[PDB]
Ligand SMILES: C[C@H](NC(=O)[C@H](Cc1ccccc1)NC(=O)C(F)(F)F)C(=O)Nc1ccc(C(F)(F)F)cc1
């Protein structure tokens with residue numbers, strides 16, 4: 333997250349860190365959202381490499397014991413049937429991960445609340461992006477969970493020529509674009525939490541930013557619109 337502030341330890345308890353094994357250690361690569369005790373929602377491009385993955389729930393400082401972490405292996409990966417690595421601009425950047433075991437819920441580990449199918453937010457709706465991604469374009473990962481206020485930019489404005497044009501689809505949410513605050517590499521797969529009827533719900537899975545930089549004026553951060561995928565999510569969990 334570029335232009336973020338450090339998040340309190342229990343503010344966003346459905347946030348997970350998706351990590352892959354490198355050498356002996358494990359390295360953070362993407363965020364995700366816990367949606368069942370044994371299921372995580374993330375971006376399909378985070379699991380395009382055939383790496384050994386683990387999930388960390390209750391995490392706050394990547395590089396330090398918080399006393400609240402639970403470490404679980406990824407047992408099955410289900411990416412969207414239509415996802416195509418060579419075309420993120422087509423959409424379908426979503427994947428569900430079955431965990432090797434059920435995590436224990438407590439105040440640091442909670443299920444994310446998903447929107448109703450079909451729900452579209454009005455322009456400039458209040459949302460926060462969270463994650464441990466790069467804090468500057470071409471910078472480095474954050475050690476502690478970051479958050480940034482990233483109001484929605486509706487489809488009509490985001491698909492206009494000065495913004496993303498044809499690259500953004502209606503299966504996506506755009507948020508930000510002020511040149512200051514944005515998601516950045518390592519935030520992918522994570523939540524866009526939006527306040528709807530006094531409740532934060534996860535309306536976006538972080539997908540992409542401009543080739544030109546993370547915080548680029550009129551290039552909002554782009555998210556997979558979770559409410560476009562509610563029937564697919566439920567059909568996957570129901571069968572696995
Ligand atoms: C450097 C920048 N990286 C990104 O946008 C990558 C995630 C990504 C990359 C490729 C595919 C899907 C998702 N993510 C990030 O930096 C994020 F965490 F903010 F999301 C980038 O290249 N973005 C980008 C790439 C291609 C397109 C195209 F789809 F229009 F072709 C649009 C934006």
Ligand SMILES: [Ca+2]
Nearest residue numbers: 393396397398
């Ligand atoms: Ca830690």
